[PDB]
């Protein structure tokens, strides 16, 4: 059992979703998300006559304001019985210390913990901006469908009508489809991040390959983001006007591993779409009596006396991240 302050990572490397589209964090002192409580977009046009001023403007009463945040509280043991991750030859005598082994093993345990919540949050993000629906579900828990409201024109499919696979691999240009799906996106699209084989049949067209610019032509901080997360986001290059990226991230589930992304999917939208990170109550007596009922995360190291007389690291959170405008992204399944 070590203090709360032993929670230093400086490792925030989420794959460009919770850090770039979903910056809009709202931890609450209350259980649910109350979209009426969030101001979101403000009623933002009307003025008043040059004699007096008008009424009082409020948070404009969101129609649906009741969903259950994913209160996730996992834990692990940091029992000093293992040989640990030994960074090359930094004096294993301190590993021989139970104190250093226990502290850096709580380091390792907790980092596994937040990357676990981060990967489940990224699955929530990919569900969110791929269908507008999120499955708040788990065993011994009712499945609540949390819908931002993704429209039908945001779910139009490439296989409908003519498929890119069922097209000329040399002369056909899918740019026409690119603006066709981008027009009904309530904004400009500046990233065309694909799943791998989706980008494969996208680039199979020649027009794509002599239309794209392999050069840097550094447009924004997206190159810096790729250099940071050189793991699963791949900056293919410029398609001229728009940036071409491929995400091949993978989640390692209970017995097997598989990619986050489905077979062939796309979301057309902006890099500055508004993403909410509403956070529920944290059900920990420590959190309430020290005021961490409204926060992002909560770690603790703590000893059980009695039957499971041991010591554990416990991580608690409650995210219900969504997208403010589901119509911002057009979600297309590809050929």
């Amino acid at each position: 059992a070590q203090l709360l302050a032993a929670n230093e990572q400086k490792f925030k490397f989420d794959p460009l979703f919770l850090r770039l589209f979903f910056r809009e964090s709202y931890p609450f002192t209350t259980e649910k998300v109350y979209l009426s409580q969030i101001p979101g977009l403000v009623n933002m046009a009307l003025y008043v006559s040059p004699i007096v001023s008008g009424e009082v403007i409020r948070s404009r009463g969101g129609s649906t304001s009741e969903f259950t945040p994913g209160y996730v509280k996992p834990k692990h043991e940091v029992n000093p019985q293992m040989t640990l991750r030994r960074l090359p030859d930094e004096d294993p005598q301190n590993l021989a210390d139970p104190a250093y082994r226990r502290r850096r093993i709580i380091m390792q345990n907790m980092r596994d913990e937040e990357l676990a919540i981060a990967q489940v949050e990224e699955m929530q993000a990919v569900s969110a901006v791929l269908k507008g629906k999120y499955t708040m579900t788990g065993e011994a828990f009712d499945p609540v469908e949390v819908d931002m409201g993704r429209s039908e024109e945001n779910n139009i499919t490439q296989s409908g009508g003519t498929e890119w696979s069922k097209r000329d691999k040399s002369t056909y240009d899918p740019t026409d489809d690119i603006e066709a799906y981008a027009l009904n996106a309530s904004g400009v699209v500046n990233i065309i991040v694909f799943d791998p084989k989706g980008w494969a049949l996208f680039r199979s067209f020649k027009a794509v390959k002599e239309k794209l610019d392999t050069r840097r032509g550094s447009n924004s901080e997206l190159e810096t983001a790729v250099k940071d997360l050189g793991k699963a986001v791949s900056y293919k290059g410029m398609y001229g006007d728009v940036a071409i990226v491929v995400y091949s991230g993978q989640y390692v589930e209970n017995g097997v591993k598989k990619n986050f992304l489905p077979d062939n999917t796309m979301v057309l939208g902006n890099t500055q779409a508004r993403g909410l990170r509403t956070y529920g109550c944290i059900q920990d007596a420590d959190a309430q009596r020290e005021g961490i009922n409204a926060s992002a995360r909560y770690p603790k190291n703590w000893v059980t006396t009695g039957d499971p007389a041991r010591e554990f690291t416990m991580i608690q959170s409650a995210p219900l991240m969504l997208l403010a405008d589901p119509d911002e992204f057009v979600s297309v399944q590809l050929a």
């Binding site: 000093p80 301190n94 210390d97 139970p98 104190a99 250093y100």
Partner: peptide, 16 residues
């Protein structure tokens, strides 16, 4: 018993 109390091997200031 040396587990719950651990001296590093260094100058006293940087060891305390």
């Amino acid at each position: 018993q040396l587990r719950s109390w651990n001296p590093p091997s260094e100058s006293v200031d940087a060891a305390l």
